[PDB]
Structure formats: C-alpha cells, structure tokens
Design a protein around this ligand. Structure first.
Ligand SMILES: *[C@@H]1O[C@H](CO)[C@@H](O)[C@H](O)[C@H]1NC(C)=O
Lengths: 96, 48, 49, 49, 48, 49
C-alpha cells in the first residue's frame, strides 16, 4: 500500500498528518530490441593469424579489416593460445 | 516504436521510447547527442 | 548442422603442450560471513576475564 | 527585495544511474546519501513557501 | 581465519581452461555444465 | 565529465569492462556524482539562508 510505504520511508509506525515523497514512478520496459548491420560475410582474421610466413619487427605489416562479421570465439579457443591480455576491454564481452 | 523499450543499437545500451523524428540530418552524420552527452537521436544501421 | 553425442571425451595424450595438459584439480568452497564454530584453526584457548 | 527562490527536487536514479539497472543495485551500498539530499531540498521548499 | 565449512568439488579439466572456473566469466564448460556465483570464495588445488 | 574514468556514459563500461573491473570505474563515477549532488544542495543551502 502507498500508506505502508510512508511507514517504511520515515521508519515510524505512527505517521502524522502531512505530505511525504516516498519514491518515484518509472515505467519499466516490456520488450527487448537489438539492431546490428545486415552483413554476414567472414573476414580474413584467420588468414592474418594462421599465415605461413610473418613480417619482422621493422616495416611491420598492417591488414585493413573492415566490413565483415567478426567472431572472436573461434580465435581464443585454440590450444597454443596461452596468454590473452587486453587493454581497456574485457576479453569475454568482445562479440557484443 | 511508440513504446518504452530496452534498445541496444550497435553497442549503445539503454532504455527509452523511439518515435519517427522530423529532424533534418545531414548524410555524413549518424548520431545526434544533446546537452551533456545525452543520447537524443540515433540512426539505425538497417533501413537508415 | 548440430549433431554429436553431448558428452565428449578429453582425448588423453601426454604429447600435448604444457598449456593444455590434463591437470586434476579440486576446488574448495568456504563462506566468509559470521561463522558458527565448526571449522577452526590451531589456535588455543585462554580463560575469560 | 527577494522573498523566495525556485523550488527544485532532484532524483538519484535518473541523474547518477540514468537508465541503468546495474547502477541502482550498487548505489544502495552507499547508505543514506539520497535520503539526505531529498529531505534537504524538501526542507528548503517548505521554508521558502 | 575461521570459516563455516569447507567443501571439495572434484573434477578433471585440462590446462587451457583453468581460468573460467571463477566468479563472472563465460566458456564452454562454464556456462552450461559447471558454473559458480559472482561472490564465490575458494582456492584451486591444482597439482601435477 | 568522465571524472578520470574510461567514459562519461555508464552503460557502455558495464558493457565493455568485466564486473571485476567495471565496478571500480563505476564507484569513481558514483562518488564523483554524489559529490556533485552534495555540493549543489550545500550551495543551495547557503543561498536559501
Ligand atoms: C541491409 O540489407 C537488407 C537486406 O534485406 C536491406 O533491406 C537493407 O536496405 C540494407 N541496409 C542498408 C544497405 O543500409
């Protein structure tokens, strides 16, 4: 009851005459929506990681990765992938 | 539209009611932020 | 498109690398709130003043 | 000569937490900060009236 | 330090997946098979 | 203002950082906003007097 909420707010069973602000109204959502772009194609994350030969320290190669559906869950499930340290990002919430 | 829903639009999570705007956006823009980084407007990546 | 027996074997093989070798581990579970006296350490007692 | 001011009231959930649910769970671990601030502006609003 | 009681959950896993038996992560054996809450307190006895 | 945290919005740091790390930056933003709300009423209490 709204009268019982005044007894919990002021912490007293005998509530005197007056006006009291107990709580605030808030309409909670009933549905849940998510929108992602219409792409489906996979991009060469596998080719950059599992290439045959690699570049040296100087003149490093940089692959432009854009317009794909990324999927990191196929990356860090590999057996020689020992360490995985991230910066400003948690390693588990990478797919979202 | 026209109901308060939990929206997750390209990583921006939150709660609010969405309605069709009358705003004249330029095509290079994709987001409209109000006073003090308030997410006032958004463009969906599907039908734009 | 999705079909295997749900319980899969670990495929025990000693030639694996050390970062994926089978290691038998047991975990413990102890609560950290107000404890009734059931599990205590080796501390002795002293008379009450 | 001024007599009164603009009476105001501020909420904590829509200001600090905004639209997040996880912020409302952690803010109750802080005590009675928002009960102090709501009664103070209420005590202001009855004073200027 | 005193506690209420101490348990022992015996299982076998391999070397690559020892980190996600911990409060607040995800995984193949963490999500659907063996999970533990966000306020868990315990030690891993990992011998060779 | 970010108050020295990663971002000014709090919904994304709950979505980007893990809860072992994300409540550290949330407690930075909560104590920054609770100090912002406490000082605002305190300047109001001097002005209302
Ligand atoms: C995304 O693809 C769908 C395919 O049905 C199309 O209807 C929609 O217009 C596309 N959106 C773009 C290209 O922004």
């Amino acid at each position: 009851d709204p009268l019982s909420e005044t007894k919990c707010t002021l912490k007293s069973f005998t509530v005197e005459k007056g006006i009291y602000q107990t709580s605030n109204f808030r309409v909670q959502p009933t549905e849940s929506i998510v929108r992602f772009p219409n792409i489906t194609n996979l991009c060469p994350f596998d080719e950059v990681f599992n290439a045959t030969r690699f570049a040296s320290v100087y003149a490093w190669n940089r692959k432009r990765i854009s317009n794909c559906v990324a999927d990191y869950s196929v990356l860090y499930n590999l057996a020689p992938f020992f360490t995985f340290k991230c910066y400003g990002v948690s390693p588990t919430k990478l797919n979202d | 539209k026209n109901k308060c829903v939990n929206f997750n639009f390209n990583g921006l999570k939150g709660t609010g009611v969405l309605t069709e705007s009358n705003k004249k956006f330029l095509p290079f823009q994709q987001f409209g932020r109000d006073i003090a980084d308030t997410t006032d407007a958004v463009r969906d990546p599907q039908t734009l | 498109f999705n079909c295997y027996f749900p319980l899969r074997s670990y495929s025990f093989r000693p030639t694996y690398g050390v970062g994926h070798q089978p290691y038998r581990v047991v975990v413990l579970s102890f609560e950290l709130l107000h404890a009734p006296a059931t599990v205590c350490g080796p501390k002795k007692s002293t008379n009450l003043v | 000569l001024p007599v009164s001011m603009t009476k105001t009231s501020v909420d904590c959930t829509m200001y600090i937490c905004g639209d997040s649910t996880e912020c409302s769970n952690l803010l109750l671990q802080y005590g009675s900060f928002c009960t102090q601030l709501k009664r103070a502006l209420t005590g202001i609003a009855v004073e200027q009236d | 330090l005193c506690f209420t009681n101490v348990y022992a959950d015996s299982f076998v896993i391999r070397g690559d997946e020892v980190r996600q038996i911990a409060p607040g992560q995800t995984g193949n054996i963490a999500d659907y098979n063996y999970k533990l809450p966000d306020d868990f307190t315990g030690c891993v006895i990992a011998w060779n | 203002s970010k108050f020295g945290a990663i971002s000014s919005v709090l919904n994304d740091i709950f979505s980007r950082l893990d809860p072992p790390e994300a409540e550290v930056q949330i407690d930075r933003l909560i104590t920054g906003r609770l100090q912002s709300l406490q000082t605002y009423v305190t300047q109001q209490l001097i002005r209302a007097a």
